[PDB]
């Protein structure tokens with residue numbers, strides 16, 4: 007019944023995984039352990055209080071070597087040292103952000119987790135999964151997999167619906183994105199010259215791999231999409247601004263309706279929509295991968311089309327980590 | 339030699355027109371009077387200290403009901419009563435944002451002014467101008483003209499180099515925009531449901547008529563463009579994100595090269611470029627109508643294009659308001 011997980015790296019997403027599990031009321035995932043090299047006390051405190059997501063819904067105590075909500079806490083620099091065999095770990099959730107590589111993440115297999123799921127694109131991933139779109143391809147042949155990114159998780163279901171309805175010849179994606187943890191509050195030394203500037207002071211153009219990735223989850227679209235991002239001064243919630251050329255002449259109503267159909271049918275709980283005049287903060291804490299904004303569909307001359315699609319880049323994705331982990335457990 | 343102007347509405351744009359003249363040290367324009375809703379002293383203080391632009395780069399003395407840096411100051415909310423005739427005002431600069439309409443704006447000529455320049459699209463305008471693109475179309479047969487908008491002024495030059503080079507089949511523009519003073523700090527009653535929302539708290543989609551206005555000033559693109567805006571938590575500096583189908587199979591290098599040329603040659607001082615990895619605040623107080631970001635140009639299969647174009651929605655426009663005022667004054 008219950009799939010035994012361990013969270014490696016108790017950072018935003020790791021904590022958000024936990025919170026998604028408790029909030030949703032789901033009973034199919036047991037969080038057996040967490041690993042992180044900072045204080046156990048500090049970890050519980052960050053779980054308790056979040057500036058974006060509010061108070062933990064429940065009580066949070068540190069008792070001995072565990073956090074009671076009863077989750078064992080570990081501190082290993084080297085994931086291969088974790089007692090995953092002893093703890094009968096089904097799926098290790100790699101969340102630290104520094105072991106995204108398949109080479110690197112396979113350390114949890116060494117430690118005795120039966121499978122690994124990386125909360126980010128993974129280099130040499132056995133499979134990159136956008137739950138609700140391609141998780142059905144998961145099988146005994148896959149041991150270390152990627153959950154894609156928040157952005158990929160948003161763009162793909164929408165891509166799919168559009169391609170099925172009007173066909174996408176080519177498309178360009180700009181994601182207007184909230185600042186993330188790898189950005190600094192003030193200008194400072196960095197791997198990337200864009201992301202080195204004060205995060206809450208500018209619109210910052212930056213790179214995203216999501217459009218290429220949608221080329222893989224949906225092989226019909228390989229090489230037909232590219233994409234970039236613009237980071238702006240909001241702490242959470244992002245949006246895909248997609249312009250594409252359609253293979254057949256179409257309308258706003260045509261596109262909106264295929265979205266409503268998909269959202270009400272086979273992508274229920276992955277894709278949603280709004281006919282209301284909403285702004286980014288209204289999607290904060292929404293669990294969908296994508297929420298399509300009907301108001302914003304525009305179509306020039308029946309063939310050049312633009313859509314706008316919100317996503318809580320933390321909350322959507324963390325709920326997807328749960329679904330992917332459960333679907334993945336069934337192939338063990 | 340000099341052009342006599344009166345500024346109606348010493349608001350963000352009213353005051354920045356005045357700073358623009360002072361900073362450039364242009365002697366071709368003389369501010370004779372200004373009108374605003376409130377104090378003589380408050381207008382002085384606001385001019386002195388600007389949260390976005392910094393110290394007013396001279397001295398501002400209150401003296402009588404006049405400001406010395408000598409300009410006379412009024413406070414009649416009704417424009418019809420102000421005495422432009424006996425002040426010999428060549429061109430009036432309607433800058434309030436509430437007499438945008440031509441039928442309304444034509445008051446300044448009743449109240450004596452020889453010509454009128456609305457800082458903002460207008461309804462029944464004799465001619466809508468983007469300086470550096472279409473100003474040589476101004477004739478004696480024009481009394482009340484429109485300076486267009488910040489966004490119109492930045493798309494139009496770029497559309498021109500693009501079209502005239504590679505041809506625009508169809509185009510969709512998103513502007514990512516700094517908040518403006520028609521938005522509030524907190525959610526509150528507004529004629530528009532998006533713009534009612536707390537302005538530094540969300541990305542906020544909104545309508546702009548700039549794409550359409552570009553189709554009228556560049557007649558060749560009548561109804562070939564559409565656009566929207568997303569307001570984000572920055573206080574100044576916006577950007578154009580343009581996706582379009584090009585008539586000719588093209589490249590990035592080719593796109594940026596054409597922009598180099600327009601920048602150095604015929605659009606010098608209106609259009610500039612950058613090859614550097616810059617972010618929005620690096621373009622604060624830049625006087626250009628458009629600054630092209632090379633790095634950011636993308637082309638899919640040689641046909642679907644994307645460019646990114648910065649603009650100081652306050653400083654660029656306010657300088658054009660000066661250049662327009664001058665070119666207009668010559669048809670008198």
Ligand SMILES: NC(=O)c1ccc[n+]([C@@H]2O[C@H](COP(=O)([O-])OP(=O)(O)OC[C@H]3O[C@@H](n4cnc5c(N)ncnc54)[C@H](O)[C@@H]3O)[C@@H](O)[C@H]2O)c1
Nearest residue numbers: 015016017018019020042102103125126155156187319320
């Ligand atoms: N948050 C989002 O918006 C989002 C969306 C999609 C994908 N992702 C992906 O998820 C991953 C994590 O993102 P995040 O926002 O949670 O960042 P985060 O920095 O808040 O999380 C990283 C956590 O791992 C811990 N850590 C670092 N090194 C460690 C080590 N050697 N051993 C154990 N723990 C270690 C840190 O203490 C921290 O708690 C990233 O790779 C990112 O690509 C994030």
Ligand SMILES: NC(=O)c1ccc[n+]([C@@H]2O[C@H](COP(=O)([O-])OP(=O)(O)OC[C@H]3O[C@@H](n4cnc5c(N)ncnc54)[C@H](O)[C@@H]3O)[C@@H](O)[C@H]2O)c1
Nearest residue numbers: 347348349350351374375415433434435457458488651652
């Ligand atoms: N600021 C920008 O980014 C930008 C860009 C392009 C165009 N514009 C246009 O410039 C115009 C002015 O906008 P702004 O940025 O100055 O905003 P603002 O509200 O700061 O300026 C308007 C000023 O006029 C005054 N005013 C209001 N009603 C008046 C009345 N009845 N009589 C006399 N004075 C009155 C107000 O006190 C205020 O100071 C707008 O129409 C806007 O569309 C602005």
